[PDB]
């Protein structure tokens, strides 16, 4: 539990504390074992996990992050229970073994449903068909795999969940020897996550798990990493990243728009990042949680023309081929379509070369939340706009 002197960890101390050497670590087996240990808990195991000697705002943000981890793990618990119930129902209605259900086919489903309908059991045939239909979308062993890995990385990030996975009294299944196990599969799994997934903090912040600082610094590190693999000759001074090829490849970290947006002020246009790629200019803006501030956060057409004219003045690029385009990002997370549009527009990367440069992009399945409709309307009116030519 929480002790006097426990502290929340950043990525550096998670990397340093869980730095062990492992060879051929099973991701799915240790993932299922750690989640089986998690699902066997009660709600009282989640109570005393906040470290006491902290200010109240930091304790509130830690409580919000732990509540988010708890509700996402409970959602995956009920999803896994539904998965096991559907697999057991299919193996009981059909008569096939349980381990070969996941490798079955749709022709096999048609044959088994026709066999059940021939015997006169239309209810069991409808149950088998509906269980297989809701099993084709959820039945993979790696379904929410990046989200579950980010949940376990967040449980390591809290710092108070590391001793909750060991010192259990178990029985041997074949000899019935009551013993106490000191093996910690959570530490081995977090060590393998830190060793293999070098950008697990970027996926952790992009999925909306970080409640303290958000995903903006992870976005800057992601864009700097994607600039270092495309320009390949990169100098980085403070908040300015530049390629030295003569062709303009510039990333400028202007300001943080969460503190820059004064509530009750009349100032049109506050951006976060400015990316100059060749002749193109992108104003990368992270939207705010205030819907009365999103209309003030995007710059005017005259302001974008002034920024493009300043680019023509400073970089010496002629104003015949100069294009400037706004880019709006979701406030608390970063969905898959936003990252795809960021790779398409800013860095001029298609899907195949982005999957070659970034391996974890294919299994990233974050989408826009349905309850935020005004942001989706603003992003539809913003991202479908033509490049403003000076």
């Amino acid at each position: 539990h929480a002790t006097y002197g426990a502290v929340p960890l950043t990525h550096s101390q998670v990397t340093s504390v869980y730095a062990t050497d492992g060879g051929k670590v099973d991701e799915l087996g240790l993932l299922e074992l750690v989640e089986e240990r998690i699902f066997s808990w009660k709600l009282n195991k989640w109570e005393m996990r906040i470290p006491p000697n902290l200010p109240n705002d930091q304790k509130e943000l830690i409580r919000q992050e732990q509540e988010n981890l708890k509700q996402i793990l409970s959602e995956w618990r009920k999803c896994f229970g539904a998965l096991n119930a559907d697999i057991l129902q299919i193996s009981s209605l059909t008569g096939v073994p349980k381990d070969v259900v996941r490798e079955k086919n749709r022709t096999w489903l048609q044959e088994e449903v026709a066999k059940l309908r021939w015997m006169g059991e239309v209810n069991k045939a409808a149950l088998l068909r509906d269980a297989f239909m809701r099993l084709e979308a959820f039945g993979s062993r790696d379904f929410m795999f990046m989200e579950r890995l980010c949940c376990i990385y967040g449980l390591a990030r809290q710092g108070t969940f590391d001793e909750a996975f060991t010192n259990y009294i178990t029985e041997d299944p074949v000899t019935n020897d009551i013993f106490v196990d000191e093996r910690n599969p959570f530490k081995e799994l977090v060590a393998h996550i830190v060793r293999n997934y070098s950008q697990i903090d970027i996926i952790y912040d992009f999925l909306g798990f970080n409640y303290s600082e958000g995903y903006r610094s992870s976005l800057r590190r992601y864009m700097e990493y994607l600039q270092c693999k495309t320009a390949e000759n990169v100098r980085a001074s403070g908040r300015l990243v530049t390629g030295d090829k003569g062709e303009h490849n510039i990333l400028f970290d202007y300001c943080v728009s969460r503190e820059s947006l004064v509530s009750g002020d009349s100032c049109q246009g506050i951006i976060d990042f400015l990316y100059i790629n060749g002749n193109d200019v992108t104003l990368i803006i992270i939207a705010s949680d205030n819907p009365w501030l999103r209309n003030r956060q995007l710059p005017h057409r005259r302001q974008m023309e002034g920024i493009a004219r300043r680019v023509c003045f400073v970089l010496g690029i002629p104003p015949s081929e100069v294009r400037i385009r706004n880019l709006l990002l979701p406030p608390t997370y970063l969905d898959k379509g936003s990252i795809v549009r960021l790779n398409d527009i800013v860095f001029r990367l298609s899907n195949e070369q982005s999957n070659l440069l970034i391996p974890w992009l294919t299994n990233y399945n974050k989408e826009l939340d349905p309850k935020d409709v005004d942001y989706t309307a603003l992003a539809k009116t913003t991202n479908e706009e033509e490049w403003l030519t000076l």
Binding site: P291, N295, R301, V373, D374, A377, L378
Partner: protein, 222 residues
């Protein structure tokens, strides 16, 4: 840095107070004209005369009604042409009095002051067939009731507020709503008794008995 506290609905809505020394001066016309000066025709798009909502979430859930609304950012405010009529005690009392005095004079439109509990009572009267229609219903200050007539005389015969003196209000229990549904030993869907629930929904006496609720009684009309 110490900041001044916004006190009252005029400072919280951000009134300019352009007229010297007067805080109770009406502001909607000047602000509407300044907001019409704020908008511009963008060339490579302007707004329409339909009403607007300031947020995309404020659009109506009906797909047919959503055709009559659009999304304006800060131009959705200060909508309307009619102003607050003057010369009583309660807006429900004035809303009953103007309809009662204009149904005797055989007029087509009555300009009544638009509050939350007024336009809901008007919507309930329009549902039951006592009101032919409305003009400028999205105006948050005053709207026009287009009255209904049939073969010379008015459809609305008697319209009376619940606060008959204009001061004392009443809170109806669901027992009172069941009394108003079965009054004088008959089943009453004829005389419409309207109340306002705790959820600020303006509900007649039939739907209040249907879901076993009460409310603050506003007016009766038949």
């Amino acid at each position: 840095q110490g900041h001044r506290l916004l006190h009252g609905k005029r400072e919280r809505e951000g009134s300019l107070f352009a007229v010297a020394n007067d805080v109770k001066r009406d502001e909607r016309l000047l602000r509407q004209q300044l907001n019409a000066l704020l908008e511009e025709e963008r060339m490579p798009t302007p707004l329409v005369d339909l009403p607007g909502v300031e947020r995309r979430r404020d659009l109506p859930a009906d797909p047919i009604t959503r055709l009559f609304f659009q999304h304006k950012g800060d131009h959705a405010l200060y909508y309307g042409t009619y102003d607050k009529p003057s010369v009583l005690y309660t807006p429900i009392y004035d809303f009953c009095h103007r309809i009662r005095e204009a149904t005797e004079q055989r007029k087509r439109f009555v300009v009544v002051p638009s509050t939350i509990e007024t336009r809901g009572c008007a919507r309930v009267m329009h549902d039951h067939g006592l009101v032919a229609g409305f003009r400028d219903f999205h105006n948050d200050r005053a709207f026009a009731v287009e009255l209904k007539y049939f073969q010379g005389d008015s459809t609305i015969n008697v319209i009376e507020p619940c606060s008959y003196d204009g001061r004392t209000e009443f809170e109806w229990s669901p027992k009172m709503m069941r009394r108003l549904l079965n009054t004088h030993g008959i089943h009453n869907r004829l005389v419409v008794y309207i109340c306002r629930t705790a959820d600020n929904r303006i509900i007649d006496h039939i739907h209040a008995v249907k879901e076993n609720i009460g409310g603050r009684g506003l007016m009766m009309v038949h």
